[PDB]
Amino acid sequence: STAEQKTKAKVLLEEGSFLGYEDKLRQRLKLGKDDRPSVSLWSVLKSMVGKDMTRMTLPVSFNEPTSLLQRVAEDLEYADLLNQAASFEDSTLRLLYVAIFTVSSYASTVKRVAKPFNPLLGETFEYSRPDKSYRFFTEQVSHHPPISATWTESPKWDFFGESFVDSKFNGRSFDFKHLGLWYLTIRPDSNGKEELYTYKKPNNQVVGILLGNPQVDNYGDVKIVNHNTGDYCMIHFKARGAYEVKGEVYNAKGGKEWIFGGRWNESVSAKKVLKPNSLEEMQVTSSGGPKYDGTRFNVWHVNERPEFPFNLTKFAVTLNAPQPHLLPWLPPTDTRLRPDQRAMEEGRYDEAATEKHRVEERQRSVRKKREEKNITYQQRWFKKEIHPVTKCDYWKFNGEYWKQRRDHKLADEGDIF
Template identity: 45%
Template sequence: MFDPDNVGMGTVKTLTLRPRASSVAQEARVPLPEVFTPAEETLPTPKPETADRPILTPRRSTQATLTARETLSPAAMDDGESCDTDEEDEFFDAIEANAIPNLEVPAPLKSPSHDATDLPPGYDCKPYEGYRHLRHELPLSADDRPSVSLWSVLKNSIGKDLTKISFPVSFNEPTSMLQRMAEDMEFSECLDVAAKDRDALRRIAYVAAFGMSNYSSTIGRIAKPFNPMLSETFEYVSFDKEYRYVSEQVSHHPPISACWAESPLWHYFGEVDAKNKFTGKSFEIRPTGVAHAELLLPEEWAPDYPKSEKFKGKVVEHYSWKKVTTCVSGFILAQPSIDHYGDMVVTNHRTGDQCILTFKPRGWRGRDAFEIAGKVVDASGRLVYEIAGRWNSQLIARLATDGSGHIHPDMSVSGPGSPSASSDYLLLWRNSEKPPRSPFNLTPFAITLNDCPKDTLKPYVCPTDCRLRPDQRAFEMGKWDLANDLKVAQEEKQRAIRRAREEGKLPPHAPRWFRAETDGDTGERVWVPSKVEGKLEYWLERERCWREGGREKAKWKEVDEIFIEEPESLSS
C-alpha cells in the first residue's frame, strides 16, 4: 500500500495537486464482462475449486526456469529501451480488451458478495451490528481544503525523515494511517479463492494477487492520512466477506502499525514500517515490514502441515512478502503521480514455491504505467505460471508452455473457437468499479472505514479507535480551522504523555493488543495478537464492554485515554 503517512502530500498555493476527477475515474475504470454469474456462497469448510477438474500440471521445460524471463529484471526496464517482447504486448492488449480465451474466473471474483448476512459459526454477531449499515458517501460533497504552499513546508526538509515533520491539516485526507492499512482487505476474496484451491501453485498466485491488489486504491490518492497516535487502534468487521480486522499503532518513532485479520479460511497479519527519502523532486517510500498470510486448508490436502489451533481438521499454510517501493513525483510541476516499482516476492514457506510480481516503473511518457509482469516457480525453480496485468485493472495468469516461457500471441489473443484456445488462463484479480467523482478520490470501501454510527458503533469501539479522534472527525465535516486546532492540541497531548514517561511519571509504553516475536519461517520480527485461552484478547474485551452497555457503563481494561476531549460542535 502507498504509505502517504510518511510522505505528506496535499495541495499547494499556486499548483494544484488534485488530479481531475474525470482523469482519475478514467484510470480506475475497469471493463467488466457481461457473462459474470452469481458468486458462490463462502463456507467455512470449502469445496475445492479444483474438485471438478484435474489440477493443471504444466509441461516441463529445461529452459523455462527461474531465470527464463530476463524482462522481469528491473535492470532490463530502461525507459529508453524496449524490453518487452511482442508476445507480452499482445498479452497486455488482450487482457485490457477482455479477449483472453476460455478465461477461468473463480466465482468469488466474478461477483464478490456485498450482502451483509451473518458472520461464520462461532462468532457472535450482535456486538457488531453497527457494521451492517455503513455509509456510501462522505459528509463532504467536494474536496475544498484551503490551499497551502507545499514547498514552504518541504524546502528545508530535503534528506530528512518526513515522519518527524508536523504538516498542516490541509495536506490530509479524512482517514487515519490505520484505516489506509485496512484497505489491504478490500479484495479479501482472493484469499478465499486461494484457500479453496487444492493446487498449491495456483494458491500462491492468488495470495500474490491479494498482496498487490491494495495498490489499486492509491490512484489519485495524493493527500496523506492522519498520523496515528501511539496506541491508537482501528477495528473493522465485514459481514459480507466474513472477516474481522484489528490494528494498533505499536511504535511512534519509528512509526510502526501492526494488524491482524481472521476468517474461517485464512489469517492476514503484518506491520507497516517504512523508510522514506525526499530528494526535492520526489518522495520515495521503501517498506521494510513483512506481510503474512496463513491459509487454513483441509488436513487431508497436507497432513504434514502444522494444525490449526482454532479449526479442527484444518492445517496452516504460511506465506510472506514485502511491499514494493512507492514514489510520488511531479508535485512541483502540478502534475503529481504515484508509481510503484520493484519486485514483490511471495514465498510459500511449506512448499518452497515462489511468486514474483515485478511492478514496472512508469516511463517518461507514461509507458509501462501500472504494468506488472510475474511468474510462479516451484521449489526447484521451474517456471509454472506466467502472470501479466496492471495494478489499476486486473491480473491474469497463464500456464507456462514448452520453450522459453514467453507468452505467444497465437495462444493469448485467439478467439474461443480457435484450436489453440485452452483453459490455462486464470483471472487472479480484477479491480472494482470506482465512482466517477469522490472527494479525496476515496474508494467506496475507504468511505466506509471512518463511519461511526452514534448508536450502534460509537459506544462500543475501543476508546483509542481512530474514528473517535476529534481532529479527524472535524476534518471529515469540512471544519478545516477547527480540525487544524484540534490536530495541534492532539499532538501536544501526545508529546506531554511522552515527556511524562521519560520523567518516570508514567510507566513505559507497551503495546496493548500485540506483542513482538520472531517469526520461525522468515527470522524477522512479527507482531502477533495477544490471546486469552486461545482467543484474541481484543475481541473478548470488545464483546465484554458491549454486553455491559458500552463505554459509558463499562471501562475498557488497561486502555489509556489518548485523545483530546471532543468539542460539543462535533458530537451534535
C-alpha cells in the same frame, strides 16, 4: 468447509467479532465535495528537502482524513481473492491468487497524493465484515518511529504484519519503503494443511512533483514464499520512467507454473505455463476462472470509483464511519473517535488543526512524563515475539481484544483523544 476452517469460524463467532456491525456500510461522506485549494506540492516541499513525512508540516490540501491504520486496512478491499485461493487444490494456483491479492491493493492509491493521519501512540482501529466473515484489528505500537501492527482473521485465511514505513523526500521525488514482513495463512479447502506465505510490500513514490503533476507510483520487486510447499512467486512493479506489473509463479523445483500481468490501476490476467523451463513473461479473454490449458483468464479488476471528497474509494468510505450501532462497542482509542480526523472528514479544517495540536501536545507530555519516571512503554494488544517459522520478530496479537470488547471491558483501555 474443512475442520480447521469451522474451528476458526467457531472462534470468530464466539468472540463476538461481528457484534456492532449491523448498520449498512457507509456509502458517502457528509461533505458532497470540498474545495481545499490545490496548493502546488513543490511550493511546499522545496523548503523541506531531506525531511520525513512525519517531520513535515503541510497545508490541508495535502492531508486526507484517514489514518495510516485505515490505509493499511485497504489491503482487504479485494480479500475475496483469498477465499478463491483457499478453494484450489493446486498449491501453485493458490500462490497465483495470493500473489494477485498482494497486487490488488495498489489501485486505491492512485489520485490520493495526500498525507494520512499519523496515528497516535496506542491508537487502534477495528473493522469487521459480517458479509465476508473476516475481522481486522490494528494498533499503533510505536510513534518514534511510527509502526502499526495488524491482525486479520477469517475462516479460510489469516493475514498479519508490521507496517513500518520509512519515507524520504530527496528534493525530486518522495520515496516510501515498507520495512515490515507480512504473513498470509491459508487453510485450504483440500489437499494441504494450513500453509504460511510471507512477502514484503513494494515501494511507493510520489513523482511528477517538479513537473507540476504529482503522481503516486508503486515500484520494485516482491518475493512471496510458501513456507510449507515451498512454491515462490516473483512480482515486478515497474518504476515510472508506471502501472505495469508482471509476475511468475514457480513450484519448489523451480518450474515456472503460471505467469500474470496487467496494470495495477486496472486489471491483472494470468495463464498456465506449460513448459516448466519457459522464460516467457506476461505480455502487457475468459472471465470464468482459472484455465490449465494455457489460455488467458482474468483474475482481478478494479472496482468502479465514484467521485468522493479526497478521492476516496468506496471501500475507504466505509472505514472511518461512526456507525450508530458500532460506537458503543469501541475502545476509547479507536480511530473513528479521533476528533481532528473526524473534523477534517467533515470539512472543518480549523477545528481539525485545533484538535490535532491538542492531541499531539498531550501525546508529547505523556511521553516526557514516562521518560522522567523511567517508564517503559507497553503496547496494549500486541507483544513483540519471535516467529517460529520465519525466526523474525513480529507483533503477536495477544488474543484479548475481541473477547474484552464482547464483554464491554474496554471503557478504560486508553485515553489519547
